[PDB]
Amino acid sequence: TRAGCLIGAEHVNNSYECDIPIGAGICASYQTSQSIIAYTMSLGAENSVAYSNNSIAIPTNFTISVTTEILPVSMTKTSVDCTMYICG
């Protein structure tokens, strides 16, 4: 690979979602008779939007989705006695 020599993984020509990041666009995964494979990570499915000068898409329904998000606020306080640590 362009990131280094990889031993123990079978390089496949298919494209899947990146599971274990290796580098240079190559990721590894444990799939199918069953061994570690290496492949070029795909960024997503190709969706060609049906765009024209007289077509529009308006939704007729909706789904109230509630998602979670975690943000750190504080950490543990540390007051190390310098003299007792150096000259206990």
């Binding site: 529009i56 308006i58 939704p59 909706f62 509630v66 750190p72 950490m75 543990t76 640590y85 150096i86």
Partner: protein, 198 residues
């Protein structure tokens, strides 16, 4: 792996403390790591060099620990400022910022307490079922170009309607829903359709 952002900070602090407490077992070039073993095997003129080496090593370790703690505290302060901004905007109000209060049209958020952190419950609005419709930028009835006030002109194949953007609620194109501005030959794509009068 859902609460990994807090467990990561906890593990980083624990590893820093473990490294700081294990650096005492190092020699830093001295004959021993225990000061009692050095003061009991050398005189008061040769053990000073070993004590100085140990002091220099432990002081360098403390300086590295304090620098790492300052960098981590700066990161935690940035995260806490972000969390306070989100608590002020998403929770205490309705933010129109895209992808800030979660993915989708944000409605409201609920705070939740977490160990050394905060958890937000962003309630968003996501469309689910869309359909295709033929649209037109304007409508001319008597040589007068009509534009939607708050909505978009759509056609289901035979008739034309005016409806909101984020939801399909077709209504009859009336004078109260559209405003007149200009003539027909100035707008590109304007189609002919009747405009109801209440």
């Amino acid at each position: 792996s859902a609460l990994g952002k807090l467990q990561d900070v906890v593990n980083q602090n624990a590893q820093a403390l473990n490294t700081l407490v294990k650096q005492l077992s190092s020699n830093f070039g001295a004959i021993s790591s225990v000061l009692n073993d050095i003061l009991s095997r050398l005189d008061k003129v040769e053990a000073e060099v070993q004590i100085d080496r140990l002091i220099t090593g432990r002081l360098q370790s403390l300086q590295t620990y304090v620098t790492q703690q300052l960098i981590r505290a700066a990161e935690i302060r940035a995260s806490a400022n972000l969390a306070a901004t989100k608590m002020s905007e998403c929770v205490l109000g309705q933010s129109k910022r895209v992808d800030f209060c979660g993915k989708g049209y944000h409605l409201m958020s609920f705070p939740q307490s977490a160990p050394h952190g905060v958890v937000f419950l962003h309630v968003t609005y996501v469309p689910a079922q869309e359909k295709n419709f033929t649209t037109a930028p304007a409508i001319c009835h008597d040589g007068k170009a009509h534009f939607p006030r708050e909505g978009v002109f759509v056609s289901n194949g035979t008739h034309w309607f005016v409806t909101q953007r984020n939801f399909y609620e077709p209504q009859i194109i009336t004078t109260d829903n559209t405003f007149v501005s200009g003539n027909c030959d100035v707008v590109i794509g304007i189609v002919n359709n009747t405009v109801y009068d209440p």
